[PDB]
Design an enzyme around this catalytic site. Structure first.
Site, PDB file in Angstrom:
ATOM      1  N   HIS A 322       1.283  -1.610   0.082  1.00 42.13           N
ATOM      2  CA  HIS A 322      -0.459  -0.037  -0.212  1.00 42.13           C
ATOM      3  C   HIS A 322       0.659   1.086  -0.027  1.00 42.13           C
ATOM      4  O   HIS A 322       0.130   2.552  -0.191  1.00 42.13           O
ATOM      5  CB  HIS A 322      -0.888  -0.358   1.267  1.00 42.13           C
TER       6      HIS A 322
HETATM    7  C1  LIG Z   1      -8.292  -1.697   9.567  1.00 47.52           C
HETATM    8  N1  LIG Z   1      -7.606  -1.636   8.624  1.00 47.52           N
HETATM    9  C2  LIG Z   1      -7.017  -3.018   7.876  1.00 47.52           C
HETATM   10  O1  LIG Z   1      -7.229  -4.025   7.412  1.00 47.52           O
HETATM   11  C3  LIG Z   1      -6.131  -2.592   6.644  1.00 47.52           C
HETATM   12  C4  LIG Z   1      -6.002  -0.927   6.701  1.00 47.52           C
HETATM   13  N2  LIG Z   1      -5.071  -0.910   5.164  1.00 47.52           N
HETATM   14  C5  LIG Z   1      -4.752  -1.709   4.776  1.00 47.52           C
HETATM   15  N3  LIG Z   1      -5.908  -2.723   5.093  1.00 47.52           N
HETATM   16  C6  LIG Z   1      -5.951  -4.219   4.740  1.00 47.52           C
HETATM   17  C7  LIG Z   1      -4.678  -5.287   5.115  1.00 47.52           C
HETATM   18  O2  LIG Z   1      -3.366  -4.994   5.192  1.00 47.52           O
HETATM   19  N4  LIG Z   1      -4.962  -6.756   5.049  1.00 47.52           N
HETATM   20  C8  LIG Z   1      -4.488  -7.350   6.253  1.00 47.52           C
HETATM   21  C9  LIG Z   1      -3.176  -7.488   6.328  1.00 47.52           C
HETATM   22  C10 LIG Z   1      -3.163  -8.595   7.066  1.00 47.52           C
HETATM   23  C11 LIG Z   1      -3.259  -9.755   7.195  1.00 47.52           C
HETATM   24  C12 LIG Z   1      -2.588 -11.148   7.632  1.00 47.52           C
HETATM   25  C13 LIG Z   1      -2.152 -10.787   8.924  1.00 47.52           C
HETATM   26  C14 LIG Z   1      -1.897 -12.588   9.006  1.00 47.52           C
HETATM   27  C15 LIG Z   1      -2.105 -13.183   8.604  1.00 47.52           C
HETATM   28  C16 LIG Z   1      -2.879 -13.634   7.383  1.00 47.52           C
HETATM   29  C17 LIG Z   1      -3.019 -12.590   6.760  1.00 47.52           C
HETATM   30  N5  LIG Z   1      -4.226  -9.741   6.663  1.00 47.52           N
HETATM   31  N6  LIG Z   1      -4.738  -8.739   5.387  1.00 47.52           N
HETATM   32  N7  LIG Z   1      -6.040   0.179   7.373  1.00 47.52           N
HETATM   33  C18 LIG Z   1      -5.897   1.164   7.143  1.00 47.52           C
HETATM   34  C19 LIG Z   1      -7.084  -0.273   8.516  1.00 47.52           C
HETATM   35  O3  LIG Z   1      -7.763   0.742   9.009  1.00 47.52           O
END
Ligand SMILES: Cn1c(=O)c2c(ncn2CC(=O)Nc2ccc(-c3ccccc3)nn2)n(C)c1=O
Ligand SMILES: [Zn+2]
Length: 431
Positions: A322
């Site tokens: 991102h």
């Molecule tokens: C709440 N939120 C977000 O979810 C977000 C965001 N910016 C981007 N994301 C999406 C994101 O990074 N999603 C992810 C990150 C990690 C994992 C993962 C970790 C461990 C095991 C398996 C999967 N899965 N998805 N912000 C600002 C925000 O507030």
């Protein structure tokens, strides 16, 4: 006041925002519809891939002008790396290294900041698609290395090129094979478009002015934080539903279950974030394709470092995808600790209390003694309120480097980090 605001709301921010948002997506929707109609004509597959390559070129030019060259060079470099290591068992490793160098180099300001920031979403979808195809070839999910036209059509799939969700190579090939245009498909597209426009309108008009008008000190700061978070959430939901609309409208996002076709591609689940059970659920429901991609291609490959280290590596990869900005990097680094601590604490609580207080809902056959009691509901509500509190804290940054993040999180007295630290202390104590 509220009277004048609601006198001018309709002609002030509903219709302008709706018209603006529609007038900058209508050509992409037209190209997606043209791709869907063209792919139903019984053309050969390579012609379909070339047609979507041309459509992806035109969509990238339409949204990013001449600057699109960086996405084009990324696609060419990804195919070059995939072809060079086409006989190796570590295609995903080489492609992830290529992506890492490319994205970091971009973060190093070799390319203009406004340019890098403008098309980062498409360079993210292209990077995710390339890394996923490399790892799918490594794991054997994709049988043979694709031809150049198939790989380029996968990278330039017009339903996924601009704001599109990451889709797997097999999902792309299923879209290429085509499905009959049905009432269910059209309803899915229409519903996604309507939800996108609603979320955009809410993000621009309702969200920022929620508490001063719509709804009748530290509390004031937290209210401003909450409305900035909810507005940011609806902006994300707008992008998610628009991506659903484009992907479905191009012919992707279907599930052939029990010889029954369901257009059920879900990118974002707003209800699971606005009304959250856990922060883990929030993160998953934020961008389901992205959460799957990060779990399957970063988290599983980093499991040799331990669970917590794999969580940090996955969130760092999320940061990389991102764009490295101190606010978003700080939010994702805090989100790693929040989700890990809340997940292990809810597991420990569920084990000790024999209750359905896990970070996700228990299946109908679970060994927990207390399933629907008042205490279980109260604990789940407390954790959901903590999730809303975390969302307002992290979303206050999205209303800007180190000083802005420190100031905004000091106006909230660093409350979510103390709660996460306190939850971790509680976790250790009960264990
Ligand atoms: C709440 N939120 C977000 O979810 C977000 C965001 N910016 C981007 N994301 C999406 C994101 O990074 N999603 C992810 C990150 C990690 C994992 C993962 C970790 C461990 C095991 C398996 C999967 N899965 N998805 N912000 C600002 C925000 O507030
Ligand atoms: Zn249970």
């Amino acid at each position: 006041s509220r009277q004048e605001f609601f006198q001018q709301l309709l002609q002030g921010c509903l219709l302008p925002t709706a018209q603006q948002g529609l007038d900058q997506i209508w050509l992409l929707l037209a190209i997606c519809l043209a791709c869907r109609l063209l792919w139903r004509l019984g053309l050969p597959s390579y012609l379909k891939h070339a047609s979507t390559v041309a459509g992806g070129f035109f969509s990238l030019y339409h949204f990013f002008q001449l600057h699109m060259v960086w996405v084009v060079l990324l696609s060419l470099l990804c195919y070059l790396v995939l072809f060079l290591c086409r006989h190796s068992s570590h295609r995903g490793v080489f492609l992830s290294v290529t992506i890492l160098i490319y994205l970091l180099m971009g973060e190093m300001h070799m390319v203009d900041t406004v340019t890098w920031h403008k098309m980062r979403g498409a360079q993210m979808i292209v990077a995710m698609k390339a890394v996923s195809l490399g790892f799918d070839l490594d794991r054997g999910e994709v049988g043979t290395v694709p031809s150049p036209v198939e790989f380029m059509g996968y990278l330039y799939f017009v339903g996924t090129i601009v704001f599109g969700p990451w889709i797997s190579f097999h999902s792309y090939l299923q879209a290429v094979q085509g499905r009959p245009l049905s009432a269910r498909w059209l309803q899915k597209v229409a519903r996604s478009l309507a939800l996108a426009l609603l979320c955009l309108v809410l993000s621009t008009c309702v969200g920022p002015y929620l508490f001063p008008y719509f709804i009748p000190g530290t509390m004031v700061r937290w209210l401003r934080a909450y409305e900035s978070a909810v507005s940011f959430h609806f902006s994300n939901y707008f992008v998610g539903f628009l991506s659903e609309a484009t992907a479905t409208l191009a012919g992707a996002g279907f599930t052939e279950e029990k010889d029954h076709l369901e257009w059920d591609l879900t990118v974002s689940k707003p209800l699971n974030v606005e009304l959250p059970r856990s922060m883990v659920e929030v993160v998953t429901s934020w961008n389901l394709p992205m959460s799957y991609w990060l779990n399957n291609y970063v988290f599983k490959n980093a499991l040799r470092l331990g669970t917590f280290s794999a969580v940090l590596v996955t969130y760092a990869a999320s940061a990389l995808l991102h764009g490295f900005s101190f606010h978003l990097a700080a939010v994702l680094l805090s989100l790693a600790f929040i989700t890990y601590v809340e997940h292990v604490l809810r597991k420990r609580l569920a084990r000790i209390l024999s209750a359905c207080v896990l970070s996700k809902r228990c299946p109908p056959d679970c060994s927990h003694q207390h399933r629907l009691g008042l205490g279980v509901r109260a604990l789940n509500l407390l954790f959901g309120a903590l999730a809303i509190f975390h969302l307002a804290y992290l979303g206050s940054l999205f209303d800007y480097g180190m000083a802005y993040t420190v100031h905004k999180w000091s106006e909230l007295s660093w409350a979510s980090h103390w709660v996460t630290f306190g939850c971790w202390i509680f976790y250790r104590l009960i264990g």
